C-alpha cells in the first residue's frame, strides 16, 4: 500500500517557524506532483501548496504565497513544507496529499498548534464503578496541551463499546474522557485498562481500572 507519513508538527510560538516533512512510500514518489493540504480546527479544508514531480515548479494560493514554501527530495522520497511568521490562524492539521487518480491518497496528517501556551503532559485517572448486565469504565485524561491525545482500551483489543469524547479547552489546558463497556462477566474478573498517549509530550501511560476500594 502507498504511504504518506508527515512529521515535524506540534506546538509553535506565534511568529515562529516550522518545517513540516513527509515520507513517501509505496509508489514512485518522484513521478507525481505532491501537495500539502491543511484543515483548520473549524474543519475547513485548505490547499496550501503543490510542487511538480521534478520539483522545478511550486504553486501556492496567493494568500499562503510567502510564508509557505513547498519543496521535495526525490532521492530521499520526502516532501517538505516550510512555514514562517506562523500566525495563530495557521493552526491546523497538515496533510500530505497525492491528487493523481492512480495514486489518490492523503496521510493521516500532522497537527500544528500555533500558541504561546506550554506543553504539559496529561494526567490519567481511572473511572471505576462507584458504590449489572454491562460495565462501563472510564478514563479521565486531564490537563494536557496541546492536542491530540489518543486513547485505546486494552491495547485496542476492545474496539467496540468505546467512546472517546472530544476535549474541552479550559485555561490553555485540554481535558477529555473515554468510556468503554464490557459485559458484567468480564471485569473485574478480566482486567480493563486504557492506554493514553500524548505525542507532544511523548507521554505513554496505561491505567488499569481497579474496583475502587472496599
Amino acid at each position: 500500500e502507498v504511504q504518506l507519513v508527515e512529521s515535524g508538527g506540534g506546538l509553535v510560538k506565534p511568529g515562529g517557524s516550522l518545517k513540516l516533512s513527509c515520507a513517501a512510500s509505496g509508489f514512485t514518489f518522484s513521478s507525481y506532483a505532491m501537495s500539502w493540504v491543511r484543515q483548520s480546527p473549524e474543519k475547513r479544508l485548505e490547499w496550501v501548496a503543490e510542487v511538480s514531480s521534478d520539483g522545478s515548479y511550486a504553486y501556492y494560493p496567493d494568500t499562503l504565497t510567502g510564508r509557505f514554501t513547498i519543496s521535495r527530495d526525490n532521492a530521499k522520497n520526502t516532501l517538505y513544507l516550510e512555514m514562517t511568521s506562523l500566525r495563530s490562524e495557521d493552526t491546523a492539521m497538515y496533510y500530505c496529499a497525492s491528487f493523481n487518480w492512480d495514486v489518490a491518497y492523503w496521510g493521516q496528517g500532522t497537527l500544528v498548534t500555533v500558541s504561546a501556551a506550554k506543553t504539559t503532559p496529561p494526567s490519567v485517572y481511572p473511572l471505576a464503578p462507584g458504590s449489572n448486565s454491562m460495565v462501563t469504565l472510564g478514563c479521565l485524561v486531564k490537563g494536557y496541551f496541546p492536542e491530540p491525545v489518543t486513547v485505546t482500551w486494552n491495547s485496542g483489543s476492545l474496539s467496540s463499546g468505546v467512546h472517546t469524547f472530544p476535549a474541552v479547552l479550559q485555561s490553555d489546558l485540554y481535558t477529555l474522557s473515554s468510556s468503554v463497556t464490557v459485559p458484567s462477566s468480564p471485569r473485574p474478573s478480566e482486567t480493563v485498562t486504557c492506554n493514553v498517549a500524548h505525542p507532544a509530550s511523548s507521554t505513554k501511560v496505561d491505567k488499569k481500572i481497579v474496583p475502587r476500594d472496599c
Partner: protein
C-alpha cells in the same frame, strides 16, 4: 484563485434515503474541447483524512460504492447518494483542479434514526485526582438519539451549573447514535464539603429523568 461554495452546511436523512449535495464554482471548470469538468468530490469520515470519491465531475474512484455518483458541468455540480447508509456519515468536500486547487466549505451528512434513550453512568473522583486538589465527577450519557438532551447536577438536592463541562461525540457510523459526557469539577476541598452528587439526564426519549447519583464514598 477560484472560489468554490457548498450549501447546505448540513443534511439529515434516514438510512436508505437518496441525497444530493450541491457545489458551485466561481468560474467554469470545464475544458471546452473535452467537455471535462475538473471537479472532484472528497469524503471525510470523523477521525479520518479526506478520501477522493469522485473526480472529473462524474468519474467514480475505483472501489467506491456505485450509490455514489456525481453530475454537473461548468460551474454547477451535484453529488448523489442513491441509498444513504449509516457508514456514509461524513463531510463531503468538493474541490476544483481547473486552476490550482480550491476546496468547498463541505456539506455534512447526518443520519436520522429511531429515537433512543441514553445509558447514564456517574463516576466519583479517583483517589489519584484528589491527591492533587482535584474533584472531577464524570457522567456518561451513552448512545442516544436525537442529540438534544438535558444534563444537570444536583449536589445535595441543589442544582449546580458552575464548574461543569459537556462534550458530545460525533454521530456513530454503525448505530448512528450520540454520546455525551458531563463532568463536574470542584476543588478537592469544595468537593468534600458535600455528600450528595447526582447527575440528571432528561432526554426526549422519556418524560421521567434518568438519575444516577452517589454519596461521598459511601461504598
Amino acid at each position: 484563485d477560484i472560489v468554490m461554495t457548498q450549501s447546505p452546511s448540513s443534511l439529515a436523512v434516514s438510512v436508505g434515503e437518496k441525497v444530493t449535495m450541491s457545489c458551485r464554482s466561481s468560474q467554469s471548470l470545464l475544458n471546452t474541447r473535452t467537455r471535462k469538468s475538473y471537479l472532484a468530490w472528497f469524503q471525510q469520515k470523523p477521525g479520518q483524512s479526506p478520501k477522493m470519491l469522485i473526480y472529473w465531475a462524474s468519474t467514480r474512484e475505483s472501489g467506491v460504492p456505485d450509490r455514489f455518483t456525481g453530475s454537473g458541468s461548468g460551474t454547477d455540480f451535484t453529488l448523489t447518494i442513491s441509498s444513504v447508509q449509516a457508514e456514509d456519515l461524513a463531510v463531503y468536500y468538493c474541490k476544483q483542479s481547473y486552476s490550482l486547487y480550491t476546496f468547498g466549505g463541505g456539506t455534512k451528512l447526518e443520519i436520522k434514526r429511531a429515537d433512543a434513550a441514553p445509558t447514564v453512568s456517574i463516576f466519583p473522583p479517583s483517589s489519584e485526582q484528589l491527591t492533587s486538589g482535584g474533584a472531577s465527577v464524570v457522567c456518561f450519557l451513552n448512545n442516544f438519539y436525537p442529540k438534544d438532551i438535558n444534563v444537570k447536577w444536583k449536589i445535595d438536592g441543589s442544582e449546580r451549573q458552575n464548574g461543569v463541562l459537556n462534550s458530545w461525540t460525533d454521530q456513530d457510523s454503525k448505530d448512528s447514535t450520540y454520546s455525551m459526557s458531563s463532568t463536574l469539577t470542584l476543588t478537592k476541598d469544595e468537593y468534600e464539603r458535600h455528600n450528595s452528587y447526582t447527575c440528571e439526564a432528561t432526554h426526549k426519549t422519556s418524560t421521567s429523568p434518568i438519575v444516577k447519583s452517589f454519596n461521598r464514598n459511601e461504598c
